[PDB]
Design a protein around this ligand. Structure first.
Ligand SMILES: [Ca+2]
Length: 357
């Protein structure tokens, strides 16, 4: 028996097919794992389902990247207890961290210590991954995501800065969940693409903040070229090759596709409108796909692979103080950090299925 037994799988396995639970990957977090400074595997009974660090390199060696912005990932900021995975953030008085700011020069902010874990079982399309999670009531990022070992391909389940802040400085972002993915060129020619259309910042009328709410959120990774997103059992977004459909604030579907880019090669940039990727309106997903000539996966050919996902991925859950938030002082302040509950991400369960006939 599992915590999710009574919860319908919202993704469609397809005609003639059903969903098969991926037992080793899935975890309903009902055991005890006490936090430790050591890098260790953890799980129920004898099982090793996770380790308390950012994901290893393809060769198995540690990846010692400590996080974006002024984040420092810390082994002992991860525990399992009370039926939940707990991943939290804290600060040490006087501790600071430098990172490259928006002017391509170093800047410093208070260092945010935070947990980060990686699942020992990788996933690849076709696969559905869903978690039940209490989003942190914090301006920090509550993250559940997938990343290839070589750091080139990424599919996010949740990236949410759910708390408006005690002074509401993060109110604009707190009402949204970023439904996202990334593709990268690795150094030396480092480039990063993620969805920047207005509709990728998903919300719902009557929800002012996600912080403190417990939601179910998942991604159905259908194929190299298709992702579907789900919140509380409802499909809310599809990315399909070169077109997008997303549920608007009132629940109604809008079909869109990219209006323009400067190039579809590696030095290309988005044409923007109102601060977001400029998108045109279509009348169905097929109409949008017909009209579009620009990938919504890899518009600038960073992967040089037919603009598609192609690599198995590690499941990562973490908290982050990202550079853009930290530079803008949207990161937590001392008063907010006095409330532990607000700074602790709780995952009740994460389940993984693949479609089988
Ligand atoms: Ca649980």
């Amino acid at each position: 028996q599992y915590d999710w037994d009574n919860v319908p799988i919202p993704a469609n396995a397809g005609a003639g097919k059903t969903w098969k639970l991926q037992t080793a990957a899935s975890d309903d977090f009902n055991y005890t794992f006490n936090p430790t400074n050591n890098v260790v595997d953890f799980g129920p009974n004898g099982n090793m389902k996770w380790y308390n660090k950012y994901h290893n390199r393809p060769n198995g060696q540690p990846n010692n990247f400590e996080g974006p912005g002024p984040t420092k990932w810390m082994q002992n900021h991860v525990a399992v207890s009370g039926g939940n995975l707990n991943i939290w953030a804290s600060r040490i008085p006087g501790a600071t961290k430098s990172f490259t700011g928006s002017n391509n020069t170093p800047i410093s902010r208070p260092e945010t210590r935070a947990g980060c874990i990686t699942n020992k079982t990788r996933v690849k399309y076709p696969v559905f991954v869903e978690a039940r999670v209490k989003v942190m009531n914090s301006t920090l990022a509550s993250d559940i995501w997938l990343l290839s070992p070589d750091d080139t391909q990424e599919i996010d389940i949740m990236e949410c800065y759910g708390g408006p802040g005690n002074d509401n400085r993060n109110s604009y972002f707190a009402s949204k969940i970023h439904l996202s993915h990334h593709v990268f060129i690795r150094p030396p020619n480092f480039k990063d693409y993620q969805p920047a259309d207005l509709n990728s910042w998903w919300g719902k009328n009557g929800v002012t903040q996600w912080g403190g709410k417990t939601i179910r959120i998942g991604v159905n990774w259908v194929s190299p070229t298709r992702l579907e997103y789900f919140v509380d059992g409802q499909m809310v977004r599809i990315l399909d090759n070169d077109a997008v459909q997303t549920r608007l604030a009132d629940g109604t579907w809008q079909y869109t596709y990219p209006a323009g880019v400067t190039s579809t090669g590696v030095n290309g940039q988005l044409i923007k409108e109102n601060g977001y990727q400029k998108m045109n309106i279509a009348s169905s997903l097929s109409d949008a796909k017909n009209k579009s000539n620009i990938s919504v996966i890899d518009p600038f050919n960073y992967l040089n692979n037919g603009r598609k996902f192609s690599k198995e991925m590690d499941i990562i859950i973490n908290v982050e103080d990202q550079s853009w938030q930290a530079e803008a002082y949207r990161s937590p302040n001392a008063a907010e950090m006095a409330n532990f509950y607000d700074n602790n991400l709780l995952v009740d369960w994460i389940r993984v299925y693949k479609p089988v006939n």
